[PDB]
């Protein structure tokens, strides 16, 4: 079977990847993304993250690097081998390796 990528992020980043063709609705009408409006609570972000990592259709989750640091508890607690998670930069937000949970494991890294 196939899988899809999913997004948790700001309106601009979500808009970008939607024109990049990322956007789809599950059969239950739920999207494969959350637009994190400034008014959104941490519980909506974390619930969406926990839904996306447990969902059958989603293979990869993309999280804006600043949102990844908000949801850091669940993001570091996620330790399944298959469903991947990516912390990504954005225009008013941090760089691509900020606190990165994978890079911090390696002995061979500089």
């Amino acid at each position: 079977r196939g899988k899809l990528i999913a997004v948790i992020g700001d309106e601009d980043t979500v808009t970008g990847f939607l024109l990049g063709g990322i956007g789809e609705l599950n059969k239950n009408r739920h999207p494969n993304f959350l637009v994190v409006e400034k008014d959104t609570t941490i519980n909506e972000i974390e619930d969406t993250f926990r839904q996306f990592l447990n969902r059958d259709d989603i293979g990869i989750i993309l999280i804006n690097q600043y949102i990844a640091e908000m949801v850091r508890h669940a993001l570091d607690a996620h330790q399944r081998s298959i469903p991947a998670v990516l912390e990504i930069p954005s225009k008013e937000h941090p760089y691509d390796a900020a606190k990165d949970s994978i890079l911090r494991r390696a002995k061979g890294m500089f």
Binding site: L25, P31, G59, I60, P89, A97
Partner: protein
């Protein structure tokens, strides 16, 4: 991994700035994009390697043809929106590899 993150950062910054050019000529096109969703133009498949006696999971990028945003900004801004879709559509394939 380190090299792929280094590649991703600059492409993402260029894509994130390119959206401002669309926001200059196409107005708040973002609301129409976000509101109107049905089916993806790009999706993935899980795949394996068995090297050194162990199964390693990986992904490949696939394309479904149908542009669910084809007419967006037909009236104005469509030049910028055509650059914009291509920039994030390029970024996704590096994400699938990075994952």
């Amino acid at each position: 991994i380190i090299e792929t993150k280094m590649l991703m950062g600059e492409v993402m910054r260029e894509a994130a700035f390119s959206l401002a050019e669309a926001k200059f000529t196409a107005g708040d096109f973002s609301t129409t994009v976000i509101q109107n969703v049905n089916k993806a133009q790009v999706k993935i498949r899980a795949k394996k390697d068995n090297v050194a006696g162990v199964t390693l999971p990986v992904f490949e990028h696939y394309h479904e043809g149908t542009d669910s945003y084809e007419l967006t900004g037909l009236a104005r801004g469509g030049e910028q929106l055509a650059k914009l879709k291509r920039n994030y559509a390029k970024a996704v394939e590096l994400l699938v590899e990075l994952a």
